[PDB]
């Protein structure tokens, strides 16, 4: 049954519940949505067709110049994803838009003089998504986080309590359109109905209806039958008394004086203004969501309608405000997911593109109004920039478009899956209170209750769910199983936020045996907003899986239900910070979702098809495709090029390791190789090791961690950092700057490690102040005089009349140069190095394009060999004759294919040379990279998945480490007292099971260390996957158990990968029952001996294998020291941080701590001589070296600045006495 990956190594599973609906695609919310954006849809479905059709046909005023839109297309990408990622251009497609210009006839029944329907008008290029759910704008993969805003519709709020100090609350209605101005109704203690456009101001309600041409007789008619204070409020008529306006014209004039105050009103200006707010089809919109939630919230029958407001809508919802106000309910909170709408890259892309289309329409109506007869065609009145100025303004710079977090392969997935209430259209972090921050019962199965950021924004982000899906309109869907009567059907229904509220849904964990009937007398269910035991036959639906409530970062926590919620948060959040290791160890205790993670992201290497691998190297992988999957034409093979040692947004290293041996069958949809932090398809965020909880003499205090020297020796937690140091200039008014090739003022050593071209050689020992690229620059026509001739004679150098502009290695930084890129602005050559990169890519492409030759030429060759035999058979003479010596058709295809080789290869070569494209005045750019291996060392951050942080205190030798009976050293010594406080007990189980999971391995290795027969290991492995009674094992022996299962041993001799589903995971007697297998005590604790003594530690000691995560907080990046650096100019002060060059900010609270103590000269020197004072710092420095410790303080310079800043006003500030 198992995939061709599990043929190598399989992960055992713990627990009961069968999986009815398997884990869906994790990149859905991105890929599917942007797919729904750019598509050819022959109808109003959202996308380019949507904004395009709605803004079109653009027509002039009476000119009959109407510009019609037909269809569109996206030309093939100018550059592929790999090439565009190296250069830094945008990965995009040209938008070819069919437009039709039909000129009508002068005063006729729609005649046509001429029709110019001009072929594709080119408007920009638009960014294309990858299969990764990412975009490339410049050189880097970035993600656009889906957002969450207030669903368009009608809002009913209250603002009870503190409004004005009466506790009388308020009833305030509201309207939230998708596009156009807001609407509000605010009630005051005076009880009068107040209507407000946007947030602007307060106006009596009569100014709206009377402006709609409603006299007084038709006002009190609609809202009254009746003066009653307990049922029917006389609120409209009580508002009509403060009414200034008696009619339409008056109300419109007052409105025009409201929206735009401080200008003389008129009639025609006010009519257009008010008609352009909630009425006109251009300015205001609802669309499909607005009228939908509008109607349903108004209890209307119709579920659809116009995207504009009418008098009946306004008066309707107004009546709803009065109904909710007096005695009738009920309030609608903003927390429910029915009032929350999710937006994806597709929808927002359509909105921005629409803005571009309206801004260009404004310019279209003009040139179409003032133009002549047939001359101007599409491409005249329509420009490019009005579009890319929108779409680029979104994709390039937006609060919703943030750089992908590429360090952790889990971080990309948990990034592309997210929710943000902040950003455009949603509430910010400076306003929205604790309400929207908290969790709502509707978040169940949709929004992850645990994984959320901790900080200024809590609950403003949250996450998705494993099985969650995007709803049709704006909402979220949750998977549920249809239960009709007592039979639980396998149909998976999806209920929205408001839908699920009214049904009665059971829980994913409910015991049903036999054919799946509920055994219990009353199962637990959630009816409406609550939970309790319900009747046996009253179950409408039941949750699909127990993981559907949580998210990927949550589900990946082993024994989640064991840990406290807070430490679960901290743990899962820390997990996203884990840095890739040098060797990826699969987790001994996983959730089984690791494969669903590593594969769901591009960090791994998937398979378009399958069949035996042809050529497996550390660089490329070549597969021979089988026939059933392969398409008839061109035949072909599967060529894969693995990215080797490349940079990342976190300064980490991304690299691919081929996992296939050679000459092996593979199945489609399987992993050919392993990227960073991915072990044979399983996601490995780090490594695990032997842990023991004991006090060690105090190096384990609090979260401090003691690590054996064996760990830093074996080079496991080591990481590889890559940094990008780039240099470009030239183009000076005095002439261009040349890159090296000569660099006066330096001796032989600097030029030794630079190539003849002047670029650094590939590879080097580079640290401190070395020269990566030589960079010069002119000053010019300095008058020679007799002296400079002597100067130019004896040295003469370049001739060196010129300065030294060089890029040098930053001080205090080091590494090794690996890769160098150059981009030479078109029109300017480079001597050698650039030609070497161009030629290098040219050969890498040429030997690849020969594969489609030698494979196809040999096949067609053998085909000639077959046909000529029936035609004059000679087999041996066929072997004898040279290779160059129906004949029509075959001889034809030979030549056609060869010529195709020529044109394709030449196209690739020119593509290599041409695009460097850079900024104006930028001549030559060189991106140099430096790679270093940063190991582990005291102070580095190390933590578990369970919410236990840590910092390595000391690195102890292999001796002092407490050891067992067999002398095995413990890898990490941790504190016992952390667990009973932090209330995370999962790290107690993940250790215990680990001791079991490792133990079996330690036995398997031993049993393979004795090289027994195939049969004994077969039986033992049978027992290993059997364990406690039940489920759901599906044990071994299915395939061949000799040659087929032999590899399952070698992968088990390290440890025994085990899957512990979230709430379906292991249990006590399960852990003990697996510990019985190899040899282990139930207590999970053994005897230890101090390596510094040799005696025994009293009491047992809990030991096992726990999974450790190395975040990127590493000390080497943090630690800083400043004695005397550069200061600030305006106010002479130290610089921008711990980060260079400055020094720590000594705050006002620190000044308070110094004020508490009697320390006086301490604070004085602190804010005077140390930093602020201009003269005191130098006059002090001339002292410190002399050996006289004293100060001549003077006055701080920034006070002297404050004096001038106040003196810039009309204020005078002096210094007296």
């Amino acid at each position: 049954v198992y995939s061709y990956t599990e043929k190598k190594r399989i992960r055992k599973d713990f627990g009961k519940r069968p999986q009815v609906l398997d884990v869906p695609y994790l990149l859905s919310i991105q890929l599917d949505s942007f797919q729904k954006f750019i598509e050819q849809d022959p109808e109003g479905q959202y996308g380019l067709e949507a904004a395009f059709r709605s803004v079109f046909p653009i027509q002039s005023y009476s000119g009959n110049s109407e510009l019609q839109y037909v269809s569109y297309r996206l030309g093939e990408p100018v550059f592929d994803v790999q090439e565009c990622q190296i250069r830094g251009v945008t990965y995009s497609a040209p938008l070819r838009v069919k437009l039709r210009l039909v000129i009508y006839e002068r005063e006729a029944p729609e005649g046509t003089v001429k029709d110019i329907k001009e072929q594709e008008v080119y408007m920009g290029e638009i960014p294309l998504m990858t299969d990764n759910g990412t975009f490339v704008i410049n050189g880097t993969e970035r993600v656009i986080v889906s957002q969450l805003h207030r669903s368009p519709g009608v809002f009913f709020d209250s603002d009870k309590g503190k409004t004005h100090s009466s506790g009388k609350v308020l009833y305030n209605a509201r309207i939230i359109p998708y596009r156009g101005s807001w609407l509000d109704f605010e009630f005051d203690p005076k009880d009068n109905l107040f209507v407000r456009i946007d947030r602007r101001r307060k106006l009596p309600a009569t100014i709206i209806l009377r402006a709609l041409n409603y006299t007084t007789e038709q006002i009190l008619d609609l809202f009254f039958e009746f003066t009653n204070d307990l049922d029917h409020g006389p609120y409209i008529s009580e508002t009509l008394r403060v009414d200034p306006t008696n009619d339409r014209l008056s109300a419109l004039v007052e409105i025009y004086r409201m929206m735009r105050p401080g200008e003389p009103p008129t009639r025609e200006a006010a009519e257009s203004l008010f008609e352009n707010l909630f009425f006109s089809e251009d300015r205001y919109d609802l669309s499909a969501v607005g009228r939908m939630k509008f109607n349903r919230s108004l209890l209307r029958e119709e579920i659809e309608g116009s995207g504009i407001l009418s008098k009946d809508d306004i008066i309707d919802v107004m009546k709803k405000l009065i109904d909710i106000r007096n005695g009738k309910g009920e309030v609608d909170d903003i927390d429910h997911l029915g009032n929350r709408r999710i937006r994806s890259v597709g929808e927002m892309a359509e909105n921005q593109f629409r803005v571009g289309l309206v801004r260009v329409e404004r310019a279209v109506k003009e040139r179409l109004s003032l133009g002549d007869l047939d001359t101007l065609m599409p491409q005249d009145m329509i420009n490019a920039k009005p579009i890319s100025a929108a779409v680029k303004e979104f994709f390039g710079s937006s609060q919703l478009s943030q750089f992908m977090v590429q360090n952790n392969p889990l971080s990309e997935i948990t990034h592309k899956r997210r929710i943000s209430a902040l950003g455009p259209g949603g509430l910010t972090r400076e306003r929205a209170g604790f309400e929207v921050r908290d969790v709502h019962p509707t978040h169940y199965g949709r929004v992850c209750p645990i994984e959320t950021p901790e900080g200024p924004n809590i609950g403003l982000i949250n996450s998705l769910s494993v099985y969650a899906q995007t709803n049709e309109y704006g909402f979220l869907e949750t998977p549920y199983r249809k239960v009709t009567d007592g039979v639980v059907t396998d149909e998976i229904h999806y209920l929205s936020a408001i839908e699920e509220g009214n049904y009665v849904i059971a829980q994913a964990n409910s015991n049903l045996d036999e054919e799946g009937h509920f055994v219990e007398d009353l199962v637990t269910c959630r009816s409406k907003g609550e939970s309790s035991l319900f009747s046996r036959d009253q179950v409408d639906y039941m949750d699909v899986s127990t993981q559907q409530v949580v998210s990927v970062g949550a589900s990946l926590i082993p024994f989640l239900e064991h840990d406290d919620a807070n430490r679960a948060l901290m743990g899962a959040n820390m997990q996203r910070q884990a840095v890739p290791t040098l060797r990826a160890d699969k987790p001994l205790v996983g959730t089984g979702m690791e494969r669903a993670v590593a594969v769901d992201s591009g960090v791994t290497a998937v398979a378009k098809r399958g069949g035996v691998v042809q050529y497996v190297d550390a660089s490329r992988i070549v597969i021979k495709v089988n026939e059933d999957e392969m398409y008839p034409g061109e035949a072909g093979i599967d060529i894969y090029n693995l990215t080797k040692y490349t940079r990342s947004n976190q300064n980490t290293c991304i690299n691919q390791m081929p996992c296939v041996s050679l000459g092996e069958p593979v199945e489609r949809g399987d992993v050919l190789a392993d990227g960073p932090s991915t072990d044979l398809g399983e996601l490995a965020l780090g490594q695990n090791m032997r842990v023991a909880f004991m006090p060690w003499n105090g190096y384990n205090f609090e979260d401090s961690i003691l690590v054996s020297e064996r760990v830093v020796q074996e080079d496991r937690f080591t990481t590889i950092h890559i940094q990008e140091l780039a240099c470009v200039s030239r183009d000076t008014k005095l002439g261009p700057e040349e890159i090296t090739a000569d660099i006066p003022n330096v001796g032989e050593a600097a030029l030794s490690k630079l190539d003849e071209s002047g670029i650094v050689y590939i590879g080097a020992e580079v640290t401190g102040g070395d020269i990566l690229v030589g960079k010069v620059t002119p000053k010019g026509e300095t008058q020679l005089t007799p002296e400079e001739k002597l100067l130019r004679a004896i040295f003469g150098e370049k001739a060196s009349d010129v300065k030294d502009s060089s890029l040098r290695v930053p001080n205090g930084v080091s590494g090794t140069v690996i890769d160098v890129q150059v981009f030479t602005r078109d029109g300017v050559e480079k001597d050698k190095r650039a030609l070497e990169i161009e030629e290098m890519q040219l050969k890498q492409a040429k030997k690849d394009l020969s594969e489609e030759l030698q494979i196809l030429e040999a096949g067609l060759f053998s085909r000639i060999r077959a046909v000529l035999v029936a035609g004059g058979v000679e087999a041996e003479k066929l072997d004898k004759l040279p290779r160059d010596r129906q004949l029509e058709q075959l001889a034809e295809q030979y030549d056609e294919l060869k010529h195709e080789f020529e044109k394709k290869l030449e196209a690739k070569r020119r593509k290599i040379t041409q695009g460097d494209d850079l900024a104006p005045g930028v001549l030559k750019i060189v991106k140099v990279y430096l790679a270093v291996k940063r190991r582990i060392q005291p102070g580095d951050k190390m933590a578990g998945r369970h919410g236990n942080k840590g910092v390595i205190s000391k690195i102890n030798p292999i001796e002092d480490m407490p050891y067992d009976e067999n002398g095995t050293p413990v890898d990490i010594v941790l504190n016992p007292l952390g667990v009973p406080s932090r209330m995370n007990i999962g790290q107690i189980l993940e250790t215990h099971l680990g001791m079991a999971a490792k133990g079996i391995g330690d036995k398997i290795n031993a049993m393979l260390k004795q090289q027994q027969e195939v049969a004994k290991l077969r039986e033992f492995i049978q027992r290993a996957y059997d364990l406690g009674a039940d489920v759901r094992q599906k044990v071994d022996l299915s395939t061949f158990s000799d040659e087929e299962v032999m590899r399952l041993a070698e992968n088990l001799r390290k440890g025994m990968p085990i899957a512990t589903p979230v709430f379906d995971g292991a249990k006590e007697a399960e852990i003990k029952e697996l510990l019985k297998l190899g040899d282990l005590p139930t207590s999970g604790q053994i005897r230890l001996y101090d390596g510094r003594t040799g005696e025994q530690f009293e009491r047992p000691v809990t030991v096992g294998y726990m999974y450790m995560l190395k975040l990127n907080h590493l000390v080497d990046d943090k630690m800083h020291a400043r004695s005397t650096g550069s200061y600030s100019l305006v106010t002479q002060q130290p610089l921008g941080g711990k980060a260079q060059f400055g020094g720590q900010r000594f705050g006002e609270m620190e000044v308070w701590a110094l004020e508490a103590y009697g320390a006086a000269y301490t604070l004085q020197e602190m804010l005077t001589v140390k930093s602020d004072d201009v003269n005191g710092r130098t006059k002090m420095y001339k002292n410190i070296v002399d050996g006289n410790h004293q100060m001549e303080p003077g006055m701080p310079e920034s006070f002297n600045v404050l004096l001038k800043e106040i003196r810039s006003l009309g204020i005078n500030i002096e210094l007296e006495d």
């Binding site: 000076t732 002597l790 300065k803 550069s1126 610089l1135």
Partner: protein, 380 residues
Amino acid sequence: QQAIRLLQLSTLELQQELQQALESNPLLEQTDLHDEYQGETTQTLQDYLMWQVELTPFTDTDRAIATSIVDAVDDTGYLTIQIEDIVDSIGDDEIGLEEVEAVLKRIQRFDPVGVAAKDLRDCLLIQLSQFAKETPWLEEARLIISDHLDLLANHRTLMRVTRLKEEVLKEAVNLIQSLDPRPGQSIHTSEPEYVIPDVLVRKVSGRWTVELNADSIPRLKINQQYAAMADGQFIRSNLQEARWLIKSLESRNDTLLRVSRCIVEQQQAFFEQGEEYMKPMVLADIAQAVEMHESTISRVTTQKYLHSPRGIFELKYFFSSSSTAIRALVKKLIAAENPAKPLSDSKLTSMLSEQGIMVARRTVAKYRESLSIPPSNQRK
């Protein structure tokens, strides 16, 4: 004459003139007004040398002498003043002209070594004093530059004068070449001065777009809240003058665009390959292409600069007041590429016609013959 003065001023000078003119009449540019923090850091140059004088004791009286020297230090690192001229600056009779040499040498000896030395041989000689370090070849080396024998190296003429042994002396001269002549002037962050482009030129694929213009062009809007239409006729007369102004301005940009198209087309050979070797177009030749008067095209040609892929140019330099260059082009082209298929004579003439250089199929042959290379004999 308002339009003619309008066109040919520098793009920077024009906008300056309009800004004054913009104040006088109510017209408004695009203001980018939508009605609803550090650019600075320290640097040390001679300030580094002043770090010396504060910590190193000169007492009080000599420190002022040393402070008077650092001002005279050029960016190149050598004194502008004469050693007796700084003596004039101190205005004291206790300097003796001997004491100034005492302090001048001491500030020379702080790194950069060699700094602040008159005549450059000092710098080389006083480089050597600290550099001496007892060894190796400097004893002979210090003789050459000190004896005034620094006529060399102009070229073994030293051997007659120096009498040292021949070829081994180059192991001194080689050691002399390792001295920095003039520390320490180093690159500041000055871009440096960048000439704002008038017009623009570059090539989109297989085409040349001269479309220009940089953002130098002012965008003027004549509409304001004064649309209301002795008093009233003033605003009509000024609005009339301002409506003519935008028209004359729009024509300037329209002319620059046109003139640029025709000056690049005529000269493309220079533009396509290298520099110079420009066919000498005449103002009249471009003046014949389009209706513009030669006086108007000379004026617009004067101060309006041009951006090119290689260099930036005044557009006046395009004007002016053969066999060898084409030969090098032929050699460069045929020597370049030709990996398998040689470049045929027909292909060369095609390539050169495409780029704008005019050569006959027969003249390319004679040029290739004078180069001594046989056509097409070479192959894979």
